[PDB]
Amino acid sequence: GAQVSTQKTGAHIHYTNINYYKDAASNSANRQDFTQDPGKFTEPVKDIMIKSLPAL
Amino acid sequence: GAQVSTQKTGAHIHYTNINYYKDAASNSANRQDFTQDPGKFTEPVKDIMIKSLPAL
Amino acid sequence: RVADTVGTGPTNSEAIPALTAAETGHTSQVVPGDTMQTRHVKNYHSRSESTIENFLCRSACVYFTEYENSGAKRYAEWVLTPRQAAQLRRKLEFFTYVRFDLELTFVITSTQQPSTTQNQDAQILTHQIMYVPPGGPVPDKVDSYVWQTSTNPSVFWTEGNAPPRMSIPFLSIGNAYSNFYDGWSEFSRNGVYGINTLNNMGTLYARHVNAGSTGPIKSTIRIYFKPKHVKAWIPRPPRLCQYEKAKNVNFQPSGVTTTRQSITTMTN
Amino acid sequence: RVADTVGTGPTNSEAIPALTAAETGHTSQVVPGDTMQTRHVKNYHSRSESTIENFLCRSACVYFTEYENSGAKRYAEWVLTPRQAAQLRRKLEFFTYVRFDLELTFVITSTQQPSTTQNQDAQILTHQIMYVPPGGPVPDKVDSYVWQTSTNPSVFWTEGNAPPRMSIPFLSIGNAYSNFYDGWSEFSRNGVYGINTLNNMGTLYARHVNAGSTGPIKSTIRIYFKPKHVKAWIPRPPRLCQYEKAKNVNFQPSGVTTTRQSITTMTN
Amino acid sequence: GLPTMNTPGSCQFLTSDDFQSPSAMPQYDVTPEMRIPGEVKNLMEIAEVDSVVPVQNVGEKVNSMEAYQIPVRSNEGSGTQVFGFPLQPGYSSVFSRTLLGEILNYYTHWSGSIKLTFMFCGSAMATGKFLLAYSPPGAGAPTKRVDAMLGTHVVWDVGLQSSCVLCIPWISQTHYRYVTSDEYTAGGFITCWYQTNIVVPADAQSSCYIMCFVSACNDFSVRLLKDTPFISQQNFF
Amino acid sequence: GLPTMNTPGSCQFLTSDDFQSPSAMPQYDVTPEMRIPGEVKNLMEIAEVDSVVPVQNVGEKVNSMEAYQIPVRSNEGSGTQVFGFPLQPGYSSVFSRTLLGEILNYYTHWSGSIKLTFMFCGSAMATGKFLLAYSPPGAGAPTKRVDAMLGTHVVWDVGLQSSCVLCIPWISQTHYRYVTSDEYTAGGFITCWYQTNIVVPADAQSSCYIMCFVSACNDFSVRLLKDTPFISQQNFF
Amino acid sequence: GYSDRARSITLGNSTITTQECANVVVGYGVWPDYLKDSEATAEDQPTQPDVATCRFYTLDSVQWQKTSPGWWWKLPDALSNLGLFGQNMQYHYLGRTGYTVHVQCNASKFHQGCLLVVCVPEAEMGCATLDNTPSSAELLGGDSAKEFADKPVASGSNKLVQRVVYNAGMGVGVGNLTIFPHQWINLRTNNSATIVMPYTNSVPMDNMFRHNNVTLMVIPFVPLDYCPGSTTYVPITVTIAPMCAEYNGLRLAGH
Amino acid sequence: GYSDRARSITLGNSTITTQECANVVVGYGVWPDYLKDSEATAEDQPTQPDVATCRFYTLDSVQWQKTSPGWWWKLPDALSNLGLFGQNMQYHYLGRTGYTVHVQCNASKFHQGCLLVVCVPEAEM
Amino acid sequence: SITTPEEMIEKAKGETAYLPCKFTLSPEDQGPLDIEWLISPADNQKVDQVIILYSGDKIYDDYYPDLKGRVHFTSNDLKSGDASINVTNLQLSDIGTYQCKVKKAPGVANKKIHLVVL
Secondary structure, X not given: OOXXXXXXXXXXXXXXXXXXXXXXXXXXXXXXXOOOOOHHHHOOXXXXXXXXXXXO | OOEEEEOOOOOOOEEEEOOOOOOOOOOOOOOXXXXXOOHHHHOOXXXXXXXXXXXX | OOOOOOOOOOEEEOOOOOEEOOOOOOOOOOOHHHHOOEOOOOOOOOOOOOEHHHHHOOOEEEEEEXXXXXXXXXXXXXXXXXXXXXXXXXXXXXXXXXXXEEEEEEEEEEEEOOOOOOOOOOOOOEEEEEXXXXXXXXXXXXXXXXXXXXXXXXXXXXXXXXXXEEEEOOOOOOOOEEOOOOOEOOOOOOOOEOOOOOOOOOEEEEEEOOOOOOOOEXXXXXXXXXXXXXXXXXXXXXXXXXXXXXXXXXXXXXXOOOOEOOOOOOXX | OOOOOOOOOOOOOOOOOOEEOOOOOOOOOOOHHHHOOOOOOOOOOOOOOOEHHHHHOOOEEXXXXXXXOOOOOOEEEEEOOHHHOHHHHHHHXXXXXXXXXXXXXXXXXXXXXXXXXXXXXXXXXXXXXXXXXOOOOOOOOOOOHHHHOOOOOEEEEEOOOOOOEEEXXXXXXXXXXXXXXXXXXXXXXXXXXXOXXXXXXXXXXXXXXXXXXXXXXXXXXXXXXXXXXXXXXXXXXXXXXXXXXXXXXXXXXXXXXXXXXXXXXXXX | OEEEOOOOOOOOEEOOOOOOXXXXXXXXXXXXXXXXXXEEOEHHHHHOOOEEOOOOOEOOHHHOOOOOOEEEXXXXXOOOEEEEEEOOOOOOHHHHOOHHHHXXXXXXXXXXXXXXXXXXXXXXXXXXXXXXXXXOOOOOOOOOHHHHHOOEEEEEEOOOOOEEEEEEOOOOOOOOOOOOOOOOXXXXXXXXXXXXXXXXXXXXXXXXXXXXXXXXXOOOEEEEEOOOOOOOOOOOO | OOOEEEOOOOOOOOOOOOOOOOEOOOOOOOOOOXXXXXXXXXXXXXXXXXXXXXXXXXXXXXXXXXXXXXXXXXXXXXXXXXXXXXXXXXXXXXXXXXXXXXXXXXXXXXXXXXXXXXXXXXXXXXXXXXXXXXXXXXXOOOOOHHHHHOOEEEEEEOOOOOEEEEEEOOOXXXXXXXXXXXXXXXXXXXXXXXEEEEEOOOOOOOEEEEEEEEXXXXXXXXXXXXXXXXXXXXOOO | OOOOOOEEEEEOOEEEEEOOOOOEEOOOOOOOOOOOOOOOOOOEOOEOOOOOOOOOEEOOOEEOOOOOOOEEEEHXXXXXXXXXXXXXXXXXXXXXXXXXXXXXXXXXXXXXXXXXXXXXXXXXXXXXXXXXXXXXHHHOOOOOOEEOEOOOOOOOOOOOEOOEOOOOOOOEOHHHHHHOOEEEEEOOXXXXXXXXXXXXXXXXXXXXXXXXXXXXXXXXXXXXEOOOOOOOOOEEEEEEEXXXXXXXXXXXXXX | OOOOOOEEEEEOOXXXXXXXXXXXXXXXXXXXXXXXXXXXXXXXXXXXXXXXXXXXOXXXXXXXXXXXXXXXXXXXXXXXXXXXXXXXXXHOOOOOOOOXXXXXXXXXXXXXXXXXXXXXXXXXX | OEOOOEEEEEEOOOOOEEEOOEEOOOOOOOOOOXXXXXXXXXXXXXXXXXXXXXXXXXXXXXXXXOOOOOEEEOOOOOOOOEOOEEEOOOOOOXXXXXXXXXXXXXXXXXXXXXXXXX
């Protein structure tokens, strides 16, 4: 039960990880978890505002 | 001969374990053994008692 | 996991769940919904940590003794029994018969004693711990021939290393260990009451393999008992009064519980 | 990765992206191409290091205390709280509620104190660190019976070895830890403002298992807190003024920012 | 010859660890398992069994069998309080020693319902009606039967059925509470009043007693294993 | 009994490491996750939100709400400078304290565009035209409106639309810059001039103010996590 | 042919009408809703009056002077003495609710000014003593609006909240307050600001007395100014309506 | 095997238990229900707390002496100062509700007596 | 945690000064309760001199001679958060700094009260 994942590499390779504890809180950090959702902070308005159209 | 089992996780992942001794009493504790049978302590009566029906 | 609360509505009927009889010795097992209006709830709580394996499988110090590299006392002997320490003992006494595997870990520390000796040079101290089975020969002196450990399991530990650890299989002539024995060893009932041939494991002997230094050194050994693959039978009430003697359940009468200023009082 | 710049040409039209209203509380989100002619660019930059897991998952010293092998002070006790150190604290206070796993690493160093004692022989010092849960008994003295650690997790470390490390699961009666609590513990609002039953972890006790040497020795223990599997909710403005008391956000009024000679000035 | 690198935490002794150790005695045959009744597999099963609770724990009564009994009688009045105590099974003196309280002292958090069973121990001719009631936190302990009725209550009538069960529902902001006394996680107040006066015939005692039994429901759990303060030791035995 | 060989770096403690450690408490059930609004998964999302910037940070104005406001008025002249500051979000005093500047102090490099939003806070009758402009490095800060026009500029006219946005394009030799002040990686100069004079009617104030909001674009990134100098501590609390 | 800057919100038996508004900020994109059976904890059936509890409650007005530092309110505390909502919590142990904050302020074309309307959850405020904590009376002003101080509050032995407007009593930059859901009223473009806030707390439900979930702050970054012969007195009315309120833990009234 | 003279009524968070009752009289054969859209008049949406308003409210007890003539109560008025019910009407112009009256009195076999429990609508005195 | 630990009390002569030292204990606190009232004189003589001590569920009222039979704990519970003392006869000498210490392992809480008599 070994998990093979891609290493952080530059642009323009793989690593194997096994869990030796059943605790699960004893695992390593989830470094490769990049997710972006700024829509809530930037625009929490009720009516969608198109850039081409004037605000008011 | 590696045994893959599920780690303890919260609600609302896996770990591999191998035995290096043939003694077997040399193994780790069975932490994941949750079984409930309180019926004997709570109701060891001969005749089953229904809650809807009055006791006596 | 645990049971999920079930949504209920006002009910007028002949059914009377709350009314019951405690004389039958049967627990009522009445849910909250029987006596009041509740909302459906999806409980995700789990009874994982309340299991006997989780409750009893922890290392607990049962006995610590000391020895010297010179002088009269040169070796320390202790017979295996968990009643030495009140903590681990009280947890074990929760049931009548317990069957489990045993794991032993020893922590050894050496402290230099005050002396007028000069130019003291110390060499890495090596400690030998020997386990003797019941009926096995016991060493009379530190430099006795018994320390050969031909058929006796023994462990040699050098200071600055991880503590020595060994796993012992369940040993009992009987099917399970007995926490409480009601009776006498003698068929004539003329002996210490509660003595049993059961729960007899062995004796532990600890000594310094080498003197190490001209100056006096004293080392204390602590024995840790961790139960494994534990099994429990016949649960009994927990100890209410402080333990006096390991051999007998002798106790001093103790107030059922603490008092309060009066009934109807919400504080201690 | 990040968004790629899009090539644009001169445009004359009724569309007015730059003109907008900031009263709506909506960010304009205007790209460079809307207001000027750009060339197509294939950006390969990635927002990897700016993630909360990457930002908060580093070991930071939160508290260091010392104890002796003789004299009055023989043991050191510290309650678990990350507000002791301003650095780790300020990073954590960025959000309102944070849920995360905790990893503890301890660095222990012993320094010999000045003394008139002669012929000093030192034995490898062993240190015991015991974690006590809220409501658990606390040891009155160094040689107290509590150090048995029957149900209390404890770690024994010998000098010259890698620092002891243990992993703690998220512990909070509430769904998530609360960085800022607005209110009083008492229903009558007559208590310390901002006190919460949440964020209570435990107390750490550190002592010397053995004296080791006749001469006096003092050891300092440093506690490191590394968050793991962190989660963040409701972002808030970063601290502007220096922390005075860990218990309350009490601060001293501070200039919004540094000054300059005048407006139109390109330097500080 | 495999390259290896040690990490922080090597050669350390954590009391609560799960590793493999060598067997002191190799190839040892243990005694075969025998069928013994009342096998336990979880501590909760023990905590679900009714335990007699000493409500009248006052003065020298804790040194007698009188602590467990609860006194009631015929009084020329109505709305009086039979008894009152807070919902603190781990900390309150009344529940600190029950099968539930004894087990709740080895854990830090507790979350679930509690069942209280009251058994009238008067004569067959003796009759009466009581108002068992539980009041939520954030309100002062009710002082009159008018105030107490507002909260969760159960009118109990003495009848052929010897006991009536009052089930305290779990009403808390957080998912868990604290076994040790804590103001933030306040439990609540449990009180009993006289719905109607006790009525007895001639040549019959007007003074009776009641028994309380406290057990846990099917949704009770505990967490954070800790040591029990009760047991104390200054030297080895 | 497997042969093993340790390598340089054994039994060492690196603060930024990713290894597995034993659990202090085994088999512990944590509280179930609850839905909480405004969850954050990346620091950049926070840095993309408009932050009020105090351009007029001079004298005792930083101790008042006047630092954020920017003064404009009716003057018998043209081509005058409303304000001027360099493109140094990490180091410049004007941006060192903004949501963008506060976050840029925990990183060493930064690469992306910057959005500046200016909101006229005058009366409805007040009207005017300004010349927002950004000038590249290697040329002296423009001193007259003739020089400033040469670089990236946006003529802003006061209108029903309250604010106009000036987007500073990323024009750099290297792929990244330095958050700390650095001569090699010079950013540029941002200035504002009067395209036309402010014009007001009778019984109307001729003195108005403007507000600046600075946020990042969708192509802004940071690197090299470092500690922030701002927070200081001499003793534990 | 509707107008973008024209709106009307109808809750219970109360209706508000604005003919000059910017938009509506719905918190962090979450709309007030009831508690689900998966995230609930209290086993007892929740009580939801709905029409009586959820309705617009207009608080006392304030005067916007040229030197006005700012004002602040505790949303749960403010409505504690108004209507059934106030009565409901007095008799209930737990309470979970959402709010809609409609700040109203109007002025003539000639008048020029600017205000910031922002909802800050868990706004723990500092105290001038630097050893004590602010008193309940100083922090909470039911049926009133607590004001900010321009000059720093004097430090001594007492329980007075640092009302410093620039640190805002939270020891943070006033300009960085836009991170929370907010809206701006400028007397040249806006005549009102409307914000919808979902219930936000670590626990599923909490006591509404000793604990305050959110805090409304109105601060003018640019001051109110106008020429002579104009209207000197300019008021500001705050209307707050609870949304999807529900209570648990019936008991005798009190706190 | 239930007993005819044994019952329990559960309303809101209150439960009553009787181990010696005769039966239950449901008015004139009509069970309390809400107002239908055909027989309603007030156009505004009705507010129904349900759990808080509908629950058992215990009034003060009285003493049954040998010369006790009798007692009387006004159902709407009696509960006007108790719980949310009392508060609800204080803030509402109209109100429509049904009631369940459980009179309780117990005595020993040796005691002998008799009482009449009756609900009289529009009892103009 | 002690409510308003730093404060100043002003009272006229012979008016009986009540000093409030109400505390609140955290879950971790499980050690023996020890209360210590130490007074620092305005005379500028030796400071940190104890007046009244409460330990081992017992009270000691003789640690400072000037206050002889004048300092009594206002509350009889004492274990309860309220741990306050009241001086019956206010005097000109009374002026000074009074420190209240509540020690329950782990964690020590301290309260300082400045007393001025008019």
